[PDB]
């Protein structure tokens, strides 16, 4: 959510319904932004994931409102996108088949990953289980580094 | 007359200072 200028087209009619929902998200983000001086590394990353997951949830909310629930108007949605309450790219990915669930965009860039391949969270849990069984071990991981993703839930 | 031209404040009634008093008198 950006800052209201003269160049900001004001929010259309149906925004008054949703404001308090995404307001909460905003508040959370504010809470999630501060020097919570985690000496630890893993926990520090955890905080970051809290922001990431929160972002996902907010965007996911707007996506739901637009597409699954089919409630809010198109203009309103557009406005929201422009203001960036919800990430557009993420939504686009969601709309595409296979990524119906998707933590975030960073988990599907094969360039960034040292092995030219997606984030392990994208591997469906069942597959991982199968692999583990074959090997003998259990699910080695619980959440990837890029975001707090205990499975990315393609299924 | 240098410091007169520099004078960040020059040629004014206290319109901004009356607004400070107004903000603090409140």
């Amino acid at each position: 959510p950006r800052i209201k200028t003269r160049r900001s087209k004001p929010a259309p009619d149906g925004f008054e319904k949703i404001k308090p929902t995404l307001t909460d998200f905003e508040i959370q983000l504010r809470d999630a932004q501060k020097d919570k001086s985690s000496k630890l590394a893993a926990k520090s990353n955890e905080q970051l994931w809290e922001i990431m997951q929160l972002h996902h949830q907010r965007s996911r909310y707007i996506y739901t409102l637009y597409y699954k629930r089919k409630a809010i108007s198109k203009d309103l949605y557009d406005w929201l996108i422009k203001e960036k309450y919800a990430d557009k790219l993420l939504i686009a990915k969601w709309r595409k088949t296979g990524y119906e669930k998707l933590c975030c965009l960073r988990c599907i860039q094969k360039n960034e990953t040292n092995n030219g391949s997606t984030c392990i969270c994208r591997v469906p849990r069942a597959q991982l289980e199968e692999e583990a069984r074959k090997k003998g071990t259990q699910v080695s991981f619980h959440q990837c580094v890029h975001c707090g993703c205990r499975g990315c839930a393609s299924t | 007359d240098w410091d007169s031209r520099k004078d960040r404040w020059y040629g004014y009634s206290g319109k901004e200072y009356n607004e400070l008093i107004s903000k603090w008198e409140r």
Partner: protein, 67 residues
């Protein structure tokens, strides 16, 4: 990352408008408060954009009112 590009004549128009707006302001105002420099003291750190600025709304920019 973004490169700050502009339609040249449009850009000129914008600057022209600000030139006349600025000039107007100069005309009208009896005194013109300048900013004290530097803005912040050595004790005062770089204030967080989220904590102070992101809440408060900005003042109206300079642009001569058009018919």
């Amino acid at each position: 990352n973004e490169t700050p590009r502009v339609i040249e004549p449009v850009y000129t128009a914008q600057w022209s408008a600000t030139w006349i707006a600025m000039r107007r302001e100069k005309r009208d105002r009896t005194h013109f408060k300048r900013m004290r420099f530097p803005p912040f003291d050595d004790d005062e750190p770089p204030l967080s954009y989220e904590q102070h600025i992101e809440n408060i709304e900005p003042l109206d920019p300079i642009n001569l009112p058009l018919d």
